[PDB]
Amino acid sequence: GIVEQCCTSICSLYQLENYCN
Amino acid sequence: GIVEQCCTSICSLYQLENYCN
Amino acid sequence: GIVEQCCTSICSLYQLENYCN
Amino acid sequence: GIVEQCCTSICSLYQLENYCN
Amino acid sequence: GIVEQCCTSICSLYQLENYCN
Amino acid sequence: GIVEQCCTSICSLYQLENYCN
Amino acid sequence: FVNQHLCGSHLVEALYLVCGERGFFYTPKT
Amino acid sequence: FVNQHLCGSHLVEALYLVCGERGFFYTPKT
Amino acid sequence: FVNQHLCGSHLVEALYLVCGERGFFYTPKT
Amino acid sequence: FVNQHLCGSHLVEALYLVCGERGFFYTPKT
Amino acid sequence: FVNQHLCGSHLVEALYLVCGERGFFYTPKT
Amino acid sequence: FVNQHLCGSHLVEALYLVCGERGFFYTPKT
Ligand SMILES: [Cl-]
Ligand SMILES: [Cl-]
Ligand SMILES: [Zn+2]
Ligand SMILES: [Zn+2]
C-alpha cells in the first residue's frame, strides 16, 4: 500500500498521485 | 515572488520546482 | 462537506471520525 | 510523562486530554 | 495573551521563550 | 552541512540562523 | 475534545490523528 | 479514535488538537 | 521532483499537496 | 531571529522549537 | 498535480517535498 | 533556547521560523 510504497520505500510525487481520488 | 504568489494567488509544484537547488 | 465545514465554521473530532476508513 | 505515554508507548486522544489545562 | 498576540499581531521567539517550563 | 549540524547532531536556533540569507 | 477550526493541510493532519491505522478519505468540494 | 506514537512536534500538535482553547502543558521532563 | 520516505502525517500532508481538490484516500491497511 | 506571525498550531510548533526539553505551556484566551 | 495555495510555513513544506535532496532556497520579498 | 535534532521537513520549518523574511537556503548535499 501507500505506506510500503512511500514510507517504507521511497516514492515520487507522481507515485503519490496514485492515491488521489 | 514565489513566496507571495503562492500565498496571495496560487502556484504550481512546477513553479515551486524552480526553487530547488 | 467536512473539508469546508472545518474551515469556514467548526467541526468536532467526532465529525472527523466519520471520515476514517 | 506524556513522552513516555505517547511517544515511547502508544496513547489515545483521550489519554492526550490528560495534558490539557 | 501570547497566543492571540502571535496571531493578530506579531511576536518574537524571545517572547515565546517566556512560555517554556 | 545543516543536516549533519542539526538533524544528525543537535543544533541551536542560533546555529540554524547560519542558514539564513 | 474541543471543536476545531481546520483549514487546508491542518484538516488532513487532524484526520490523520483521528483515524490512525484506519486511515481516512479526504474529499473537498469541487 | 486510535492509539498511535505521537512524538516531538507531532505530540504537541496533537495536544493542540485535543485541548485547543483549554490550553495544555507539554512537560517532557515530567 | 524527487523520491523520498514520506511517513505518517508527512505522508498525508504530501497526499494533500499532490491531490488537493481531487481529494485522496489514505489507507495504510491497504 | 525575526518576528513571527503565528496562528493556531504554528504557534505550538514555534513553542516546541523554542522550548525543547523544557517544554512549554500553551494558554489561549478563553 | 494540482495548483497550490501556500502561505507561511506551508510553502516551505511544499518546497521541501518538491525538492528533496536538492534542497531549495526560500526567498520572500522584503 | 534549546538544542535539538531537527530533521527533514521539521528542519526547514525551523529555518523558516528562525530566518523568516531573510529567507534561507536548505542545502542538504552541503
Ligand atoms: Cl494557516
Ligand atoms: Cl517524524
Ligand atoms: Zn497552517
Ligand atoms: Zn514529523
PDB file of C-alpha atoms and ligand atoms in Angstrom:
ATOM      1  CA  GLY A   1       0.000   0.000   0.000  1.00  0.00           C
ATOM      2  CA  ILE A   2       0.961   3.640   0.184  1.00  0.00           C
ATOM      3  CA  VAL A   3       2.926   3.119   3.434  1.00  0.00           C
ATOM      4  CA  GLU A   4       5.011   0.399   1.875  1.00  0.00           C
ATOM      5  CA  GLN A   5       5.374   2.456  -1.292  1.00  0.00           C
ATOM      6  CA  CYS A   6       6.239   5.790   0.290  1.00  0.00           C
ATOM      7  CA  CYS A   7       7.139   5.385   3.959  1.00  0.00           C
ATOM      8  CA  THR A   8       8.973   2.076   3.928  1.00  0.00           C
ATOM      9  CA  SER A   9      10.394   2.548   0.431  1.00  0.00           C
ATOM     10  CA  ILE A  10      10.892   5.879  -1.345  1.00  0.00           C
ATOM     11  CA  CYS A  11       8.156   7.165  -3.653  1.00  0.00           C
ATOM     12  CA  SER A  12       7.836  10.064  -6.105  1.00  0.00           C
ATOM     13  CA  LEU A  13       5.240  12.782  -6.069  1.00  0.00           C
ATOM     14  CA  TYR A  14       3.810  11.055  -9.203  1.00  0.00           C
ATOM     15  CA  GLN A  15       3.547   7.797  -7.359  1.00  0.00           C
ATOM     16  CA  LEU A  16       1.791   9.736  -4.568  1.00  0.00           C
ATOM     17  CA  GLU A  17      -0.855  10.782  -7.149  1.00  0.00           C
ATOM     18  CA  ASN A  18      -1.777   7.133  -7.268  1.00  0.00           C
ATOM     19  CA  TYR A  19      -3.724   7.741  -4.085  1.00  0.00           C
ATOM     20  CA  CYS A  20      -5.720  10.725  -5.314  1.00  0.00           C
ATOM     21  CA  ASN A  21      -9.349  10.410  -5.952  1.00  0.00           C
TER      22      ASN A  21
ATOM     23  CA  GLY B   1       7.969  36.398  -5.968  1.00  0.00           C
ATOM     24  CA  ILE B   2       7.090  32.749  -5.431  1.00  0.00           C
ATOM     25  CA  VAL B   3       6.538  33.154  -1.670  1.00  0.00           C
ATOM     26  CA  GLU B   4       3.968  35.866  -2.293  1.00  0.00           C
ATOM     27  CA  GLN B   5       2.479  34.307  -5.427  1.00  0.00           C
ATOM     28  CA  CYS B   6       1.810  31.005  -3.645  1.00  0.00           C
ATOM     29  CA  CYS B   7       0.111  32.891  -0.813  1.00  0.00           C
ATOM     30  CA  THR B   8      -1.867  35.723  -2.412  1.00  0.00           C
ATOM     31  CA  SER B   9      -2.759  33.651  -5.537  1.00  0.00           C
ATOM     32  CA  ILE B  10      -1.762  30.155  -6.494  1.00  0.00           C
ATOM     33  CA  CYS B  11       1.292  28.385  -7.604  1.00  0.00           C
ATOM     34  CA  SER B  12       2.056  25.017  -9.155  1.00  0.00           C
ATOM     35  CA  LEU B  13       4.508  22.383  -7.922  1.00  0.00           C
ATOM     36  CA  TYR B  14       6.281  23.013 -11.229  1.00  0.00           C
ATOM     37  CA  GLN B  15       6.810  26.662 -10.327  1.00  0.00           C
ATOM     38  CA  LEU B  16       7.986  25.520  -6.890  1.00  0.00           C
ATOM     39  CA  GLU B  17      10.470  23.157  -8.576  1.00  0.00           C
ATOM     40  CA  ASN B  18      12.301  26.211  -9.829  1.00  0.00           C
ATOM     41  CA  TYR B  19      13.419  26.987  -6.348  1.00  0.00           C
ATOM     42  CA  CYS B  20      15.220  23.713  -5.776  1.00  0.00           C
ATOM     43  CA  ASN B  21      18.990  23.804  -5.685  1.00  0.00           C
TER      44      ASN B  21
ATOM     45  CA  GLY C   1     -18.730  18.975   3.215  1.00  0.00           C
ATOM     46  CA  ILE C   2     -16.383  18.293   6.114  1.00  0.00           C
ATOM     47  CA  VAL C   3     -13.385  19.967   4.434  1.00  0.00           C
ATOM     48  CA  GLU C   4     -15.349  23.181   4.030  1.00  0.00           C
ATOM     49  CA  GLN C   5     -17.228  22.929   7.327  1.00  0.00           C
ATOM     50  CA  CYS C   6     -13.996  22.556   9.312  1.00  0.00           C
ATOM     51  CA  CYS C   7     -12.571  25.605   7.541  1.00  0.00           C
ATOM     52  CA  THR C   8     -15.425  28.098   7.177  1.00  0.00           C
ATOM     53  CA  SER C   9     -17.026  27.113  10.542  1.00  0.00           C
ATOM     54  CA  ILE C  10     -16.019  24.480  13.027  1.00  0.00           C
ATOM     55  CA  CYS C  11     -16.022  20.786  13.257  1.00  0.00           C
ATOM     56  CA  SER C  12     -15.590  18.247  16.031  1.00  0.00           C
ATOM     57  CA  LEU C  13     -13.147  15.334  16.168  1.00  0.00           C
ATOM     58  CA  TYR C  14     -16.285  13.183  16.259  1.00  0.00           C
ATOM     59  CA  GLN C  15     -17.406  14.558  12.904  1.00  0.00           C
ATOM     60  CA  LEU C  16     -13.866  13.989  11.621  1.00  0.00           C
ATOM     61  CA  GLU C  17     -14.057  10.371  12.834  1.00  0.00           C
ATOM     62  CA  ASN C  18     -16.698   9.782  10.202  1.00  0.00           C
ATOM     63  CA  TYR C  19     -14.119  10.108   7.518  1.00  0.00           C
ATOM     64  CA  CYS C  20     -11.914   7.296   8.752  1.00  0.00           C
ATOM     65  CA  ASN C  21     -11.851   4.123   6.713  1.00  0.00           C
TER      66      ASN C  21
ATOM     67  CA  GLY D   1       5.211  11.650  31.447  1.00  0.00           C
ATOM     68  CA  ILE D   2       3.485  12.455  28.194  1.00  0.00           C
ATOM     69  CA  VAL D   3       6.549  11.427  26.133  1.00  0.00           C
ATOM     70  CA  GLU D   4       6.649   8.032  27.757  1.00  0.00           C
ATOM     71  CA  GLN D   5       2.877   7.749  27.458  1.00  0.00           C
ATOM     72  CA  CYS D   6       2.504   8.884  23.861  1.00  0.00           C
ATOM     73  CA  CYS D   7       5.857   8.935  22.075  1.00  0.00           C
ATOM     74  CA  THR D   8       7.566   5.916  23.584  1.00  0.00           C
ATOM     75  CA  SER D   9       4.345   3.948  24.056  1.00  0.00           C
ATOM     76  CA  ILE D  10       1.101   4.481  22.135  1.00  0.00           C
ATOM     77  CA  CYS D  11      -1.563   6.760  23.611  1.00  0.00           C
ATOM     78  CA  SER D  12      -5.166   7.625  22.727  1.00  0.00           C
ATOM     79  CA  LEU D  13      -6.570  11.043  22.040  1.00  0.00           C
ATOM     80  CA  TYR D  14      -8.363  10.668  25.430  1.00  0.00           C
ATOM     81  CA  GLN D  15      -5.097   9.982  27.146  1.00  0.00           C
ATOM     82  CA  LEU D  16      -3.735  13.093  25.385  1.00  0.00           C
ATOM     83  CA  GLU D  17      -6.506  15.115  27.112  1.00  0.00           C
ATOM     84  CA  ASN D  18      -4.720  14.291  30.323  1.00  0.00           C
ATOM     85  CA  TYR D  19      -2.333  17.095  29.464  1.00  0.00           C
ATOM     86  CA  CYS D  20      -4.950  19.769  28.835  1.00  0.00           C
ATOM     87  CA  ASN D  21      -5.362  22.574  31.208  1.00  0.00           C
TER      88      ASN D  21
ATOM     89  CA  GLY E   1      -2.061  36.845  25.654  1.00  0.00           C
ATOM     90  CA  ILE E   2       0.790  35.323  23.671  1.00  0.00           C
ATOM     91  CA  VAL E   3      -1.489  33.017  21.646  1.00  0.00           C
ATOM     92  CA  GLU E   4      -3.521  35.988  20.465  1.00  0.00           C
ATOM     93  CA  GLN E   5      -0.589  38.391  20.154  1.00  0.00           C
ATOM     94  CA  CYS E   6       1.328  35.994  17.895  1.00  0.00           C
ATOM     95  CA  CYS E   7      -1.757  35.611  15.704  1.00  0.00           C
ATOM     96  CA  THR E   8      -3.388  39.045  15.493  1.00  0.00           C
ATOM     97  CA  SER E   9      -0.015  40.909  15.549  1.00  0.00           C
ATOM     98  CA  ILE E  10       3.486  39.579  15.872  1.00  0.00           C
ATOM     99  CA  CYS E  11       5.601  38.041  18.490  1.00  0.00           C
ATOM    100  CA  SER E  12       9.294  37.324  18.911  1.00  0.00           C
ATOM    101  CA  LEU E  13      10.946  34.000  19.743  1.00  0.00           C
ATOM    102  CA  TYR E  14      12.114  35.786  22.893  1.00  0.00           C
ATOM    103  CA  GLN E  15       8.523  36.431  23.939  1.00  0.00           C
ATOM    104  CA  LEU E  16       7.753  32.794  23.112  1.00  0.00           C
ATOM    105  CA  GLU E  17      10.668  31.720  25.337  1.00  0.00           C
ATOM    106  CA  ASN E  18       8.702  33.015  28.288  1.00  0.00           C
ATOM    107  CA  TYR E  19       6.262  30.209  27.914  1.00  0.00           C
ATOM    108  CA  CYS E  20       8.796  27.432  28.308  1.00  0.00           C
ATOM    109  CA  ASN E  21       8.703  25.446  31.514  1.00  0.00           C
TER     110      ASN E  21
ATOM    111  CA  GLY F   1      26.071  20.799   6.287  1.00  0.00           C
ATOM    112  CA  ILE F   2      22.859  21.744   8.019  1.00  0.00           C
ATOM    113  CA  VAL F   3      21.658  18.105   8.118  1.00  0.00           C
ATOM    114  CA  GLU F   4      24.811  16.989   9.847  1.00  0.00           C
ATOM    115  CA  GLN F   5      24.670  20.024  12.120  1.00  0.00           C
ATOM    116  CA  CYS F   6      21.004  19.856  13.067  1.00  0.00           C
ATOM    117  CA  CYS F   7      19.480  16.513  12.102  1.00  0.00           C
ATOM    118  CA  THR F   8      22.353  14.147  12.782  1.00  0.00           C
ATOM    119  CA  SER F   9      23.751  16.187  15.671  1.00  0.00           C
ATOM    120  CA  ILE F  10      21.805  18.681  17.791  1.00  0.00           C
ATOM    121  CA  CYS F  11      21.859  22.359  16.825  1.00  0.00           C
ATOM    122  CA  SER F  12      20.623  25.589  18.426  1.00  0.00           C
ATOM    123  CA  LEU F  13      18.248  28.090  16.932  1.00  0.00           C
ATOM    124  CA  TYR F  14      21.325  30.391  16.627  1.00  0.00           C
ATOM    125  CA  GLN F  15      23.175  27.756  14.699  1.00  0.00           C
ATOM    126  CA  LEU F  16      20.066  27.456  12.491  1.00  0.00           C
ATOM    127  CA  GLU F  17      20.467  31.184  11.658  1.00  0.00           C
ATOM    128  CA  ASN F  18      23.654  30.167   9.929  1.00  0.00           C
ATOM    129  CA  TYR F  19      21.484  29.100   7.022  1.00  0.00           C
ATOM    130  CA  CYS F  20      19.534  32.336   6.674  1.00  0.00           C
ATOM    131  CA  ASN F  21      20.101  34.554   3.770  1.00  0.00           C
TER     132      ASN F  21
ATOM    133  CA  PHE G   1     -12.342  17.231  23.000  1.00  0.00           C
ATOM    134  CA  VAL G   2     -12.780  20.744  21.700  1.00  0.00           C
ATOM    135  CA  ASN G   3     -14.243  21.882  18.426  1.00  0.00           C
ATOM    136  CA  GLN G   4     -11.790  22.506  15.669  1.00  0.00           C
ATOM    137  CA  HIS G   5     -11.109  25.208  13.109  1.00  0.00           C
ATOM    138  CA  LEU G   6      -9.137  23.450  10.435  1.00  0.00           C
ATOM    139  CA  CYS G   7      -8.184  24.629   7.016  1.00  0.00           C
ATOM    140  CA  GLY G   8      -6.023  23.223   4.377  1.00  0.00           C
ATOM    141  CA  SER G   9      -3.412  20.732   5.438  1.00  0.00           C
ATOM    142  CA  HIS G  10      -4.489  21.140   9.154  1.00  0.00           C
ATOM    143  CA  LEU G  11      -7.624  19.250   8.392  1.00  0.00           C
ATOM    144  CA  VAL G  12      -5.573  16.401   6.893  1.00  0.00           C
ATOM    145  CA  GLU G  13      -3.358  16.358   9.999  1.00  0.00           C
ATOM    146  CA  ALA G  14      -6.460  16.196  12.193  1.00  0.00           C
ATOM    147  CA  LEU G  15      -7.902  13.378  10.097  1.00  0.00           C
ATOM    148  CA  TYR G  16      -4.576  11.530  10.332  1.00  0.00           C
ATOM    149  CA  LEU G  17      -4.555  11.827  14.180  1.00  0.00           C
ATOM    150  CA  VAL G  18      -8.209  10.955  14.490  1.00  0.00           C
ATOM    151  CA  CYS G  19      -8.142   7.895  12.202  1.00  0.00           C
ATOM    152  CA  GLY G  20      -4.762   6.334  12.823  1.00  0.00           C
ATOM    153  CA  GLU G  21      -4.371   2.926  11.265  1.00  0.00           C
ATOM    154  CA  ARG G  22      -7.836   3.095   9.790  1.00  0.00           C
ATOM    155  CA  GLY G  23      -6.692   5.903   7.539  1.00  0.00           C
ATOM    156  CA  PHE G  24      -9.286   8.178   6.070  1.00  0.00           C
ATOM    157  CA  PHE G  25     -10.514   9.796   2.908  1.00  0.00           C
ATOM    158  CA  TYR G  26     -10.168  13.483   2.231  1.00  0.00           C
ATOM    159  CA  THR G  27     -12.864  14.760  -0.092  1.00  0.00           C
ATOM    160  CA  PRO G  28     -13.082  18.525  -0.590  1.00  0.00           C
ATOM    161  CA  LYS G  29     -15.868  20.059  -2.535  1.00  0.00           C
ATOM    162  CA  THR G  30     -15.086  20.582  -6.225  1.00  0.00           C
TER     163      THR G  30
ATOM    164  CA  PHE H   1     -10.336   7.047  17.642  1.00  0.00           C
ATOM    165  CA  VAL H   2      -6.936   5.331  17.684  1.00  0.00           C
ATOM    166  CA  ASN H   3      -3.695   4.813  19.682  1.00  0.00           C
ATOM    167  CA  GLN H   4      -0.514   5.853  17.963  1.00  0.00           C
ATOM    168  CA  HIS H   5       3.057   7.043  18.708  1.00  0.00           C
ATOM    169  CA  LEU H   6       2.988  10.839  18.865  1.00  0.00           C
ATOM    170  CA  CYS H   7       6.393  12.369  19.190  1.00  0.00           C
ATOM    171  CA  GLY H   8       8.029  15.705  19.222  1.00  0.00           C
ATOM    172  CA  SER H   9       6.275  18.441  17.381  1.00  0.00           C
ATOM    173  CA  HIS H  10       3.549  15.883  16.372  1.00  0.00           C
ATOM    174  CA  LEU H  11       2.856  15.280  20.040  1.00  0.00           C
ATOM    175  CA  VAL H  12       2.343  18.969  20.738  1.00  0.00           C
ATOM    176  CA  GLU H  13       0.287  19.336  17.542  1.00  0.00           C
ATOM    177  CA  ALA H  14      -1.918  16.526  18.808  1.00  0.00           C
ATOM    178  CA  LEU H  15      -2.211  18.252  22.249  1.00  0.00           C
ATOM    179  CA  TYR H  16      -3.198  21.423  20.440  1.00  0.00           C
ATOM    180  CA  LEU H  17      -5.798  19.445  18.562  1.00  0.00           C
ATOM    181  CA  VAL H  18      -7.255  17.738  21.623  1.00  0.00           C
ATOM    182  CA  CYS H  19      -7.061  20.634  24.092  1.00  0.00           C
ATOM    183  CA  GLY H  20      -7.378  23.728  21.878  1.00  0.00           C
ATOM    184  CA  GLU H  21      -8.872  26.615  23.910  1.00  0.00           C
ATOM    185  CA  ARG H  22      -8.350  24.793  27.221  1.00  0.00           C
ATOM    186  CA  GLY H  23      -4.666  25.009  26.509  1.00  0.00           C
ATOM    187  CA  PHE H  24      -2.182  22.384  27.653  1.00  0.00           C
ATOM    188  CA  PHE H  25       1.178  21.822  29.061  1.00  0.00           C
ATOM    189  CA  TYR H  26       3.911  19.937  27.316  1.00  0.00           C
ATOM    190  CA  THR H  27       6.394  18.820  30.026  1.00  0.00           C
ATOM    191  CA  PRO H  28       8.692  16.176  28.640  1.00  0.00           C
ATOM    192  CA  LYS H  29      10.867  16.145  31.828  1.00  0.00           C
ATOM    193  CA  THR H  30       7.607  15.072  33.623  1.00  0.00           C
TER     194      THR H  30
ATOM    195  CA  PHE I   1      10.893  16.242  -8.430  1.00  0.00           C
ATOM    196  CA  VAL I   2      12.373  13.699  -6.011  1.00  0.00           C
ATOM    197  CA  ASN I   3      11.823  10.320  -4.267  1.00  0.00           C
ATOM    198  CA  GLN I   4      11.838  10.384  -0.506  1.00  0.00           C
ATOM    199  CA  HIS I   5      10.464   8.497   2.540  1.00  0.00           C
ATOM    200  CA  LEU I   6       7.124  10.064   3.447  1.00  0.00           C
ATOM    201  CA  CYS I   7       5.672   8.719   6.629  1.00  0.00           C
ATOM    202  CA  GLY I   8       2.805   9.294   8.921  1.00  0.00           C
ATOM    203  CA  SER I   9       1.384  12.747   8.983  1.00  0.00           C
ATOM    204  CA  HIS I  10       4.074  13.796   6.403  1.00  0.00           C
ATOM    205  CA  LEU I  11       2.706  11.194   4.024  1.00  0.00           C
ATOM    206  CA  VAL I  12      -0.824  12.548   4.282  1.00  0.00           C
ATOM    207  CA  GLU I  13       0.481  16.129   4.040  1.00  0.00           C
ATOM    208  CA  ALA I  14       2.227  15.122   0.830  1.00  0.00           C
ATOM    209  CA  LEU I  15      -1.020  13.491  -0.473  1.00  0.00           C
ATOM    210  CA  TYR I  16      -2.825  16.711   0.348  1.00  0.00           C
ATOM    211  CA  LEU I  17      -0.187  18.586  -1.581  1.00  0.00           C
ATOM    212  CA  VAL I  18      -0.301  16.350  -4.646  1.00  0.00           C
ATOM    213  CA  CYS I  19      -4.052  15.688  -4.783  1.00  0.00           C
ATOM    214  CA  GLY I  20      -5.577  18.825  -3.232  1.00  0.00           C
ATOM    215  CA  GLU I  21      -9.110  19.358  -4.620  1.00  0.00           C
ATOM    216  CA  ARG I  22      -9.237  15.859  -6.136  1.00  0.00           C
ATOM    217  CA  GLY I  23      -9.027  14.563  -2.614  1.00  0.00           C
ATOM    218  CA  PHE I  24      -7.337  11.291  -1.713  1.00  0.00           C
ATOM    219  CA  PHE I  25      -7.547   8.266   0.381  1.00  0.00           C
ATOM    220  CA  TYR I  26      -5.011   7.311   2.975  1.00  0.00           C
ATOM    221  CA  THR I  27      -5.419   3.543   3.593  1.00  0.00           C
ATOM    222  CA  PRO I  28      -2.419   2.221   5.449  1.00  0.00           C
ATOM    223  CA  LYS I  29      -4.006  -1.269   5.889  1.00  0.00           C
ATOM    224  CA  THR I  30      -4.033  -1.362   2.016  1.00  0.00           C
TER     225      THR I  30
ATOM    226  CA  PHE J   1      15.804  35.993  14.911  1.00  0.00           C
ATOM    227  CA  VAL J   2      12.865  37.540  13.124  1.00  0.00           C
ATOM    228  CA  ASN J   3       9.463  38.398  14.485  1.00  0.00           C
ATOM    229  CA  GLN J   4       6.805  35.811  13.988  1.00  0.00           C
ATOM    230  CA  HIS J   5       3.219  35.701  12.784  1.00  0.00           C
ATOM    231  CA  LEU J   6       1.865  32.516  14.250  1.00  0.00           C
ATOM    232  CA  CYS J   7      -1.661  31.277  14.407  1.00  0.00           C
ATOM    233  CA  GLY J   8      -3.167  28.092  15.503  1.00  0.00           C
ATOM    234  CA  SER J   9      -0.943  25.058  15.529  1.00  0.00           C
ATOM    235  CA  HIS J  10       2.011  27.173  14.136  1.00  0.00           C
ATOM    236  CA  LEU J  11       2.314  28.837  17.471  1.00  0.00           C
ATOM    237  CA  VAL J  12       2.531  25.431  19.181  1.00  0.00           C
ATOM    238  CA  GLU J  13       5.226  24.357  16.703  1.00  0.00           C
ATOM    239  CA  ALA J  14       7.159  27.548  17.440  1.00  0.00           C
ATOM    240  CA  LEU J  15       6.820  26.993  21.181  1.00  0.00           C
ATOM    241  CA  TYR J  16       8.009  23.399  20.734  1.00  0.00           C
ATOM    242  CA  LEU J  17      11.143  24.558  18.802  1.00  0.00           C
ATOM    243  CA  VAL J  18      11.830  27.402  21.178  1.00  0.00           C
ATOM    244  CA  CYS J  19      11.465  25.393  24.408  1.00  0.00           C
ATOM    245  CA  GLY J  20      12.835  21.983  23.551  1.00  0.00           C
ATOM    246  CA  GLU J  21      13.278  19.743  26.548  1.00  0.00           C
ATOM    247  CA  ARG J  22      11.901  22.390  28.852  1.00  0.00           C
ATOM    248  CA  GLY J  23       8.528  22.013  27.195  1.00  0.00           C
ATOM    249  CA  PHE J  24       6.068  24.827  27.499  1.00  0.00           C
ATOM    250  CA  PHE J  25       2.516  25.722  28.336  1.00  0.00           C
ATOM    251  CA  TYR J  26       0.025  26.840  25.745  1.00  0.00           C
ATOM    252  CA  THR J  27      -2.646  29.077  27.214  1.00  0.00           C
ATOM    253  CA  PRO J  28      -5.030  30.762  24.775  1.00  0.00           C
ATOM    254  CA  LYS J  29      -7.512  33.291  25.933  1.00  0.00           C
ATOM    255  CA  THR J  30     -10.930  31.841  26.780  1.00  0.00           C
TER     256      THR J  30
ATOM    257  CA  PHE K   1      -0.615  17.759  -9.740  1.00  0.00           C
ATOM    258  CA  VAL K   2      -2.970  20.468  -8.582  1.00  0.00           C
ATOM    259  CA  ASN K   3      -2.282  24.132  -8.073  1.00  0.00           C
ATOM    260  CA  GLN K   4      -1.385  25.157  -4.587  1.00  0.00           C
ATOM    261  CA  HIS K   5      -2.388  27.860  -2.137  1.00  0.00           C
ATOM    262  CA  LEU K   6       0.509  28.041   0.253  1.00  0.00           C
ATOM    263  CA  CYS K   7       1.256  30.574   2.901  1.00  0.00           C
ATOM    264  CA  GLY K   8       3.835  30.784   5.532  1.00  0.00           C
ATOM    265  CA  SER K   9       5.452  27.565   6.615  1.00  0.00           C
ATOM    266  CA  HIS K  10       3.188  25.567   4.161  1.00  0.00           C
ATOM    267  CA  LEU K  11       5.176  26.936   1.305  1.00  0.00           C
ATOM    268  CA  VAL K  12       8.408  25.738   2.945  1.00  0.00           C
ATOM    269  CA  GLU K  13       6.872  22.283   3.451  1.00  0.00           C
ATOM    270  CA  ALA K  14       5.860  22.208  -0.214  1.00  0.00           C
ATOM    271  CA  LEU K  15       9.342  23.278  -1.287  1.00  0.00           C
ATOM    272  CA  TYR K  16      10.838  20.575   0.947  1.00  0.00           C
ATOM    273  CA  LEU K  17       8.611  17.860  -0.657  1.00  0.00           C
ATOM    274  CA  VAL K  18       9.170  19.152  -4.154  1.00  0.00           C
ATOM    275  CA  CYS K  19      12.970  19.474  -3.917  1.00  0.00           C
ATOM    276  CA  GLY K  20      14.021  16.584  -1.730  1.00  0.00           C
ATOM    277  CA  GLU K  21      17.750  16.048  -1.635  1.00  0.00           C
ATOM    278  CA  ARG K  22      18.331  19.007  -3.896  1.00  0.00           C
ATOM    279  CA  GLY K  23      17.082  21.289  -1.158  1.00  0.00           C
ATOM    280  CA  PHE K  24      15.859  24.705  -2.104  1.00  0.00           C
ATOM    281  CA  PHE K  25      16.079  28.372  -1.313  1.00  0.00           C
ATOM    282  CA  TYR K  26      13.263  30.290   0.287  1.00  0.00           C
ATOM    283  CA  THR K  27      13.333  33.956  -0.641  1.00  0.00           C
ATOM    284  CA  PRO K  28      10.353  36.069   0.419  1.00  0.00           C
ATOM    285  CA  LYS K  29      10.008  39.614  -0.683  1.00  0.00           C
ATOM    286  CA  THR K  30      11.456  42.151   1.761  1.00  0.00           C
TER     287      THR K  30
ATOM    288  CA  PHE L   1      16.535  28.392  23.750  1.00  0.00           C
ATOM    289  CA  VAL L   2      17.492  24.739  23.252  1.00  0.00           C
ATOM    290  CA  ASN L   3      19.495  22.276  21.089  1.00  0.00           C
ATOM    291  CA  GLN L   4      17.514  19.527  19.455  1.00  0.00           C
ATOM    292  CA  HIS L   5      17.562  17.180  16.419  1.00  0.00           C
ATOM    293  CA  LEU L   6      15.724  18.928  13.591  1.00  0.00           C
ATOM    294  CA  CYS L   7      15.236  16.756  10.577  1.00  0.00           C
ATOM    295  CA  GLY L   8      13.544  16.808   7.269  1.00  0.00           C
ATOM    296  CA  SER L   9      10.535  18.999   6.968  1.00  0.00           C
ATOM    297  CA  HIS L  10      10.978  19.956  10.694  1.00  0.00           C
ATOM    298  CA  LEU L  11      14.419  21.288   9.869  1.00  0.00           C
ATOM    299  CA  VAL L  12      13.095  23.520   7.108  1.00  0.00           C
ATOM    300  CA  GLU L  13      10.155  24.574   9.306  1.00  0.00           C
ATOM    301  CA  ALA L  14      12.679  25.593  11.943  1.00  0.00           C
ATOM    302  CA  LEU L  15      14.719  27.532   9.301  1.00  0.00           C
ATOM    303  CA  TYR L  16      11.517  29.262   8.273  1.00  0.00           C
ATOM    304  CA  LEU L  17      10.919  30.125  11.891  1.00  0.00           C
ATOM    305  CA  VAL L  18      14.408  31.470  12.541  1.00  0.00           C
ATOM    306  CA  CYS L  19      15.014  33.233   9.217  1.00  0.00           C
ATOM    307  CA  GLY L  20      11.513  34.244   8.082  1.00  0.00           C
ATOM    308  CA  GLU L  21      11.736  37.333   5.823  1.00  0.00           C
ATOM    309  CA  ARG L  22      15.516  36.997   5.432  1.00  0.00           C
ATOM    310  CA  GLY L  23      14.827  33.733   3.700  1.00  0.00           C
ATOM    311  CA  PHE L  24      17.189  30.772   3.853  1.00  0.00           C
ATOM    312  CA  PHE L  25      18.713  28.027   1.922  1.00  0.00           C
ATOM    313  CA  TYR L  26      18.226  24.386   2.682  1.00  0.00           C
ATOM    314  CA  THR L  27      21.142  22.508   1.033  1.00  0.00           C
ATOM    315  CA  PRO L  28      21.351  19.009   2.415  1.00  0.00           C
ATOM    316  CA  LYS L  29      24.110  17.996  -0.087  1.00  0.00           C
ATOM    317  CA  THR L  30      26.173  20.820   1.579  1.00  0.00           C
TER     318      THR L  30
HETATM  319 CL    CL M   1      -2.684  28.529   8.171  1.00  0.00          CL
HETATM  320 CL    CL M   2       8.794  12.464  12.256  1.00  0.00          CL
HETATM  321 ZN    ZN M   3      -1.183  26.445   8.733  1.00  0.00          ZN
HETATM  322 ZN    ZN M   4       7.466  14.807  11.602  1.00  0.00          ZN
END
